[PDB]
Amino acid sequence: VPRGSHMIVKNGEKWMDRYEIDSLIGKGSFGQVVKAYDRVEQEWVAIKIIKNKKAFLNQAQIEVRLLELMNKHDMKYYIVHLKRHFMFRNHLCLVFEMLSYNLYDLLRNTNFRGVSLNLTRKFAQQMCTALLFLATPELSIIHCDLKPENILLCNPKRSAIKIVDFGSSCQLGQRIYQYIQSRFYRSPEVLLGMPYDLAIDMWSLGCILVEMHTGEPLFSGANEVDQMNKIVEVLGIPPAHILDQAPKARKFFEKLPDGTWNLKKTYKPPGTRKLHNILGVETGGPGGRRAGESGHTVADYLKFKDLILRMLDYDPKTRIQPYYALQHSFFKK
Numbered sequence: 001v002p003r004g005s006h007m008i009v010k011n012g013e014k015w016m017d018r019y020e021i022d023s024l025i026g027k028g029s030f031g032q033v034v035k036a037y038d039r040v041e042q043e044w045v046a047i048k049i050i051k052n053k054k055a056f057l058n059q060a061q062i063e064v065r066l067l068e069l070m071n072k073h074d075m076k077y078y079i080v081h082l083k084r085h086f087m088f089r090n091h092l093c094l095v096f097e098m099l100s101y102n103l104y105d106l107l108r109n110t111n112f113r114g115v116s117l118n119l120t121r122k123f124a125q126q127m128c129t130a131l132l133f134l135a136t137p138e139l140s141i142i143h144c145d146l147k148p149e150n151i152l153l154c155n156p157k158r159s160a161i162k163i164v165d166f167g168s169s170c171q172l173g174q175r176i177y178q179y180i181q182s183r184f185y186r187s188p189e190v191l192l193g194m195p196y197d198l199a200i201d202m203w204s205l206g207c208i209l210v211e212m213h214t215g216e217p218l219f220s221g222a223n224e225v226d227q228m229n230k231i232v233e234v235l236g237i238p239p240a241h242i243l244d245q246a247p248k249a250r251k252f253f254e255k256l257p258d259g260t261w262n263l264k265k266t267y268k269p270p271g272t273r274k275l276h277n278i279l280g281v282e283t284g285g286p287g288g289r290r291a292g293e294s295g296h297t298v299a300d301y302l303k304f305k306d307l308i309l310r311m312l313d314y315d316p317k318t319r320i321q322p323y324y325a326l327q328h329s330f331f332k333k
């Protein structure tokens with residue numbers, strides 16, 4: 001008799017005379033991931049096991065529908081492929097291609113020194129092409145949980161990547177959750193309790209590309225208030241037209257009589273932490289480690305910093321969209 005929501009995983013057991021369970025290869029809020037051998041297909045698979053709990057089951061039904069939608073608009077370009085799903089022992093089970101480790105593990109492999117600007121640019125091209133495909137009118141899909149941990153290497157030897165975990169994903173106009181995105185990668189509009197569109201994913205990507213090159217999160221807030229303050233340190237006070245609509249503006253800011261917003265009394269002065277110095281543009285890159293190294297020139301750093309600031313625009317209406325981000329000078333050969 002199953003106790004609560006957990007499937008009890010036993011290694012070596014064979015499910016429906018097809019899946020030979022090998023090991024637990026991951027765990028999350030939604031349940032767990034197992035490495036399994038598919039006898040029929042004669043190959044390795046990762047099976048996401050959804051917890052036998054109603055909230056998680058409903059969200060995983062939306063994951064199957066969106067994964068099926070995306071996989072039907074194919075050949076494969078940058079989204080994890082859903083092979084099939086089935087009910088087993090009262091758990092919904094999602095079968096995926098066996099993949100390599102996540103981009104946070106890749107950073108930990110090189111002691112958080114960071115990947116080269118050349119590798120950062122290859123990850124940025126695949127991510128922007130992926131966000132371009134999500135923005136397709138037939139899809140209009142918001143990932144909502146972009147982070148290094150939901151970006152997987154196909155193979156440890158190459159740089160090809162796939163986006164995984166559409167567990168909190170929604171389509172444009174089907175927002176159902178106030179509280180979304182991992183805090184470090186959480187957009188201003190989500191912190192402010194505002195409605196969101198596909199632009200919140202471009203905000204996550206900006207934060208992610210800086211972290212891959214520096215080896216550290218751009219915005220490492222301990223809580224929502226700390227997170228907002230860390231963003232203001234770099235980007236300054238948000239435009240008044242945005243704060244005037246934000247339900248949670250008075251969680252971090254206060255209106256003055258003359259009608260200008262400032263930070264709640266109780267960090268660097270707003271906008272004084274320059275991305276220019278965080279990238280060490282003129283002083284040899286992150287911790288000065290890329291000094292003189294080929295492909296890390298001041299000119300190369302200026303194009304990258306330019307593209308990142310367009311990704312971190314406070315206005316979702318003027319935040320660079322996937323198509324225009326691919327036309328950026330940071331990508332021309």
Ligand SMILES: Cc1nc2ccc(-c3cc(N)nc(N)c3)nc2n1C[C@H](C)Oc1cccc(Br)n1
Pocket residue numbers: 025026027028033046048080096097098099100101102149150152164165166
């Ligand atoms: C080796 C491998 N191939 C995979 C293929 C797909 C998935 C996967 C995982 C989740 N949460 N959602 C989807 N839609 C697909 N996960 C794979 N994994 C484990 C991966 C490295 O770890 C990960 C990655 C993310 C979450 C967790 Br826990 N662990």
